[PDB]
Write an enzyme that holds these catalytic residues in place. Structure first.
Site, PDB file in Angstrom:
ATOM      1  N   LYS A   1      -5.753  -6.448   0.582  1.00  0.00           N
ATOM      2  CA  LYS A   1      -7.147  -5.987   0.497  1.00  0.00           C
ATOM      3  C   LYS A   1      -7.830  -6.728  -0.652  1.00  0.00           C
ATOM      4  O   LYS A   1      -7.263  -6.847  -1.734  1.00  0.00           O
ATOM      5  CB  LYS A   1      -7.202  -4.469   0.250  1.00  0.00           C
ATOM      6  CG  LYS A   1      -8.617  -3.885   0.219  1.00  0.00           C
ATOM      7  CD  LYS A   1      -8.574  -2.349   0.160  1.00  0.00           C
ATOM      8  CE  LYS A   1      -9.975  -1.746   0.169  1.00  0.00           C
ATOM      9  NZ  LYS A   1      -9.939  -0.258   0.105  1.00  0.00           N
TER      10      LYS A   1
ATOM     11  N   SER B   1     -12.381   2.357   3.411  1.00  0.00           N
ATOM     12  CA  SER B   1     -12.789   0.986   3.113  1.00  0.00           C
ATOM     13  C   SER B   1     -11.759  -0.109   3.394  1.00  0.00           C
ATOM     14  O   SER B   1     -12.090  -1.290   3.338  1.00  0.00           O
ATOM     15  CB  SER B   1     -13.236   0.896   1.645  1.00  0.00           C
ATOM     16  OG  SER B   1     -12.191   1.274   0.753  1.00  0.00           O
TER      17      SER B   1
ATOM     18  N   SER C   1      -9.409   5.947   2.048  1.00  0.00           N
ATOM     19  CA  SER C   1      -9.576   4.540   2.392  1.00  0.00           C
ATOM     20  C   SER C   1      -8.390   3.777   2.981  1.00  0.00           C
ATOM     21  O   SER C   1      -8.556   2.647   3.439  1.00  0.00           O
ATOM     22  CB  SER C   1     -10.130   3.786   1.186  1.00  0.00           C
ATOM     23  OG  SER C   1     -11.517   4.040   1.050  1.00  0.00           O
TER      24      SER C   1
END
Ligand SMILES: [Mg+2]
EC number: 6.3.5.7
Lengths: 92, 482, 485
Positions: free
Chosen positions: C79, C154, C178
């Site tokens: 990420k 996210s 997330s």
């Protein structure tokens, strides 16, 4: 409700530029969010201590041993504006 | 109208640890800008704070030395504000759970001693440095993150003089703990002053001002003296009341309005999640408490009640831990207490100031100093000769006796040896001897001169003269020889 | 053997048994990305040059019989809010576009030590704020199960890349769900470990007291294997827990007979869609068929998860994102003249709308006169939410419920609706507020879109979560569907 001055005050505290349109938007955007946030007022927190640290851990300290700093060139590498080994910004 | 002058002092002390407060980089740096930083100091995305263990111990020690209640539960908080020398846009400090609270120190101003409360002592990090250069500023983060302890006094100060006395005592106590060199000229000791006047009889205050740029003990007292008077005039002139931030002018002695605070700065203080809470147990506190030496107040009390020294002497000798230790070590070597006190307060301190050099950095030792004092005590060395030997001893060490004779500074005062010089003078200057009996000129002066030459300028002037006259007078006789 | 759909476990075996070279593994990965990512758009910066170089090194170690490392030769996607030394890390924001870190995050230091192979960074909502990844400054990732649907947020890129067969493992971050929500949306396995289980050093902060890095994989065992590699105390993070035992695979395979499972009534409440509710109820029956004892309980403060989380996370963000001023790195407004303008213009131009919205609300929540009423009140509510779990854990081993209230929604369906999108964090936020570990595994599909089942455990009891999750997985999973997309 939220006043214009209060909105501008928050924007200044957060160091964010704000236009006339954005100011009014947040004036309303703020309430819609505050009413949403106010949902917490339905919880009973009498005698309840706030949680600052979720983890049960204390006294994590670092021994006082210095480690040489990185080279000046590396410390300034990603800075857009620099001069004489220092970060350059409009007069303070 | 009559008014009460209320003063509060906010002091910052730089801890002389090896590494920074929440970063492992060095606390001491060189001349190259931004050469003493790491990703933490640079507030890089994703970095975290790692609190310095020695810093906490030292903060605890200082707080205890100030007679404070030491927290059992303590934590750090973020003081949020945007500024170039504060890269994270927040300074890690302490809000509601400072390391220390409710302490105090006693000061001397006029007559009786006054106790000044000290609200708190907390830990935080210092900011970087910004230098102007035209229409822009240059930022150096070498100093960002260095360990600082903030000491806020209760608003118990009632005059500029008291403010100076508070600072002098505070500086002394902290210096004894060894956590900082606490020197305003070097920035290891800083002080902002807050003052406001209250007309007696009621409770409302006139304008309140925060004074900045007080870079020395004298500038603090002088800044407050001018502000106190300015505020007095404003009080009498009915000027507008408000919260002001003024900067002291060293080249004028005045205070200039920097800004008119409207409301209160909002630092959005909240507990720092990245640093777990401090749980300061008994063993920890006991461990630190045992590292505190006898402080100023306790030492001078003994110097007065036990050594019988004047309050003045006791105060000067306990100003720093080194001076006090040296004094105690010297009198234990057999050196006269009073003489040792005098030399330390005068000659020694004078020498240290003149050469901008610290006591322990000289070659003077409790041993060689006590040695010199003993020679002055028995009468072997005069104060005038002492003024010549002491500087040599302080500069190159050695021993007084040796220095005195290896330079021909030994004064001959014993009537025995002096009689030897006198007798030699009479035998080797027959014509002068008779000239004296006949007053043919300056016979006495001539004879004393010969003795001075013979003794290589060692013979005691006053004593030679007397002995000479005595023997010369006994001899109103005569003889002849071929 | 295009190994793009192989599990971490199997890929490890293949490499150890010398049935494929690390260099060919990497070739297969980039072939997959080139073929599939133009559609999925899960990746941001690729590290192909360095990946190929590393694989050559591993080829040599393989030849010499010196294959050390828990993840030797295993490709990984990271990420983009996780710092990668020398590799562009943007947080999917214009604020850090082109930003090349000069230090290494701890989880990456650990993964390189275990010899995993860094493939590239993954897309996400800007600065980790959002539940659809649509706020990304660079691209909008799509759900591999339905290209018209969002991959969640996210950590949308982390979930999508794994579900799309681009990498066998990815790291994401979870502040209010997330990691779990996108795993649920994309039908993959996502674990947000106990707060303190994984170092936060090198994680671009959103909410310091809530954030936690975690792994996403196509199966439960692969997930535990990866958690083993990234977990552990770190001197660079004072909040990292001093728990050296990071053995998460030891309980996998053991049964759950007699396991006491708590099903909170609030987790099947009004906001949960009928299809999600049905799948979870069927999962509960599956749990019982496996020998588990499942009984209803109450976590009465559940409804406060979203608002407490929102206030706390926003407030912390209004501080954690304050370092972005264009001075030392990142976006710097060229048209600023005064110091005030430098800060304000660089921040207003560099930050996207959702980010600025949260910074604004957080600043307000911490401001004079509102602090007690908003921020502090929320911290007290957080205490209540944590207390809810404590009471349940006195009598139950784990808590179960849906991961998200609905299946993934459509791209563009909730992006202009801030209030609405947060509703999707109903079942995930309490976990972060309580600092507990929570894992999501697929338990069904509705109109082709995955539904997630969530298991919440006691502090540092990830071993048990993997044990129960694995058993459930033996009854239902999407292992055969991935390679068919
Ligand atoms: Mg301070």
């Amino acid at each position: 409700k939220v006043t214009r001055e209060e909105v501008e005050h928050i924007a200044n505290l957060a160091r964010l530029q704000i236009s006339p349109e954005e100011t009014e938007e947040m004036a309303n955007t703020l309430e819609s969010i505050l009413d949403f946030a106010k949902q917490n007022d339905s919880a009973d927190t009498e005698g309840v201590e706030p949680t600052y640290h979720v983890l049960d851990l204390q006294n994590v300290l670092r021994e006082d041993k210095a480690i040489k700093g990185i080279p000046q060139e590396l410390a300034l590498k990603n800075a857009k504006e620099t001069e004489d080994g220092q970060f350059k910004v409009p007069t303070i | 109208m009559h008014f009460e002058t209320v003063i509060g002092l906010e002091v910052h002390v730089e801890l002389k640890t090896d590494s920074k407060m929440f970063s492992p980089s060095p606390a001491h740096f060189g001349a190259e800008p931004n050469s003493n930083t790491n990703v933490i100091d640079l507030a890089y995305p994703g970095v975290l704070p790692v609190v310095n263990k020695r810093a906490v111990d030292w903060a605890m020690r200082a707080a205890m030395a100030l007679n404070m209640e030491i927290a059992t539960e303590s934590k750090f908080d973020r003081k949020n504000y945007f500024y170039p020398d504060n890269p994270k846009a927040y300074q890690i400090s302490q809000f509601d759970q400072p390391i220390g609270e409710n302490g105090y120190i006693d000061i001397e101003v006029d007559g009786e001693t006054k106790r000044i409360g000290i609200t708190r002592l907390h830990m935080e990090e210092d900011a970087g440095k910004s230098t102007h250069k035209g229409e822009y500023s240059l930022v150096d983060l070498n100093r960002q993150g260095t360990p600082l302890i903030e000491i806020v006094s209760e608003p118990d100060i009632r005059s500029p003089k008291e403010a100076y006395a508070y600072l002098e005592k505070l500086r002394s106590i902290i210096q004894y703990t060894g956590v900082s060199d606490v020197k305003m000229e070097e920035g290891s000791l800083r002080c902002d002053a807050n003052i406001s006047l209250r007309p007696y009889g009621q409770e409302k205050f006139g304008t309140k001002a925060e004074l900045k740029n007080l870079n020395s003990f004298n500038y603090v007292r002088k800044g407050l003296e001018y502000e106190e008077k300015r505020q007095e005039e404003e009080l009498l002139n009915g000027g507008e009341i408000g919260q002001e931030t003024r900067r002291f002018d060293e080249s004028t002695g005045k205070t200039i309005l920097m800004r008119v605070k409207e409301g209160s700065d909002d630092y959005r203080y909240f507990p720092e999640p990245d640093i777990v809470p401090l749980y300061i147990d008994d063993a920890w506190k006991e461990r630190v408490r045992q590292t505190i030496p006898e402080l100023p107040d306790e030492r001078k009390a003994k110097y007065v009640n036990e050594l019988g020294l004047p309050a003045y002497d006791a105060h000067v000798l306990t100003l720093t831990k080194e001076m006090s230790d040296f004094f105690e070590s010297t009198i234990e070597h057999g050196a006269d207490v009073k003489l040792t006190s005098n030399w330390l307060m005068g000659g020694v301190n004078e020498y240290l100031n003149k050469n901008q050099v610290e006591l322990l950095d000289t070659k003077l030792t409790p041993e060689n100093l006590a040695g010199m004092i003993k020679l002055i005590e028995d009468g072997t060395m005069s104060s005038k000769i002492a003024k010549k030997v002491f500087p040599e001893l302080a500069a190159k060490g050695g021993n007084a006796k040796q220095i005195m004779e290896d330079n021909g500074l030994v004064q001959i005062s014993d009537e025995a040896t002096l009689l030897k010089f006198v007798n030699e003078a009479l035998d080797n200057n027959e014509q002068s001897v008779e000239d004296y009996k006949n007053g043919k000129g300056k016979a006495m002066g001539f004879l004393v001169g010969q003795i001075m030459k013979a003794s290589k300028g060692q013979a005691n002037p006053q004593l030679v003269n007397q002995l000479l006259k005595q023997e010369l007078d006994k001899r109103l006789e005569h003889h002849h020889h071929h | 053997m295009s190994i793009r759909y192989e599990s971490v476990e199997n890929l490890l075996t293949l490499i150890k048994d010398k049935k494929i070279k690390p260099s060919d593994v990497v070739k297969d990965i980039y072939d997959a990305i080139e073929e599939t990512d133009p559609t999925i758009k899960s990746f941001l910066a690729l590290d192909k040059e360095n990946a190929i170089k590393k694989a050559q090194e591993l080829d040599e170690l393989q030849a010499k019989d010196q294959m050390d490392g828990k993840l030797f030769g295993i490709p990984m996607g990271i990420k983009d809010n996780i710092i990668t030394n020398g590799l562009e890390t943007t947080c999917a924001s214009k604020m850090l576009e082109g930003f090349v870190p000069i230090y290494e995050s701890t989880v990456m230091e650990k993964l390189h030590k275990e010899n995993a192979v860094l493939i590239g960074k993954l897309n996400m909502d800007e600065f980790a704020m959002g539940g659809s990844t649509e706020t990304s400054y660079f691209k909008k990732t799509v759900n591999p199960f339905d290209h018209k649907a969002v991959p969640g947020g996210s950590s949308g890129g982390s979930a999508a890349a794994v579900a799309a067969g681009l990498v066998p493992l990815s790291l994401g971050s979870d502040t209010g769900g997330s990691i779990r929500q996108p795993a649920a949306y994309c039908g993959v396995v996502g674990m947000k470990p106990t707060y303190g289980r994984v170092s936060r050093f090198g994680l671009v902060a959103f909410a310091s007291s809530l954030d936690q890095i975690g792994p996403l994989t196509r199966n439960v065992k692969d997930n535990a294997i990866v958690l083993e590699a990234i977990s552990g105390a770190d001197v660079n993070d004072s909040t990292s827990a001093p728990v050296d035992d990071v053995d998460f695979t030891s309980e996998i395979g053991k049964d759950i007979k007699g396991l006491k499972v708590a099903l909170p009534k609030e987790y099947l409440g009004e906001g949960v869609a009928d299809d999600v509710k049905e799948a979870v109820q069927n999962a509960v029956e599956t749990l019982k068929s496996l020998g588990a004892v499942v009984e209803e309980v109450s976590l009465p403060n559940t409804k406060f998860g979203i608002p407490s989380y929102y206030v706390i996370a926003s407030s912390e963000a209004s501080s954690n994102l304050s370092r972005f001023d264009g001075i030392r790195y990142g976006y710097h407004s060229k048209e600023a003249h005064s110091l005030e303008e430098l800060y304000k213009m660089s921040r207003s131009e560099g930050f996207g709308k959702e980010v600025k919205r949260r910074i604004f609300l957080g600043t307000f929540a911490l401001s004079s006169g509102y602090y007690d009423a908003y921020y502090k009140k929320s911290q007290k509510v957080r205490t209540l939410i944590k207390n809810d779990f404590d009471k349940v854990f006195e009598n139950y081993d784990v808590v179960v419920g849906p991961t998200a209230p609905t299946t993934a929604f459509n791209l563009g369906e909730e992006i202009d609706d801030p209030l609405t999108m947060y509703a999707n964090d109903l079942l995930t936020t309490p976990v972060n507020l309580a600092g507990l570990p929570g894992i999501s595994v697929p338990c069904g599909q509705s109109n082709g879109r995955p539904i997630g089942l969530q298991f919440i455990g006691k502090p540092f009891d990830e071993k048990t979560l993997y044990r129960v999750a694995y058993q459930y997985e033996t009854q239902y999973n999407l292992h055969d569907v991935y390679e068919k997309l």
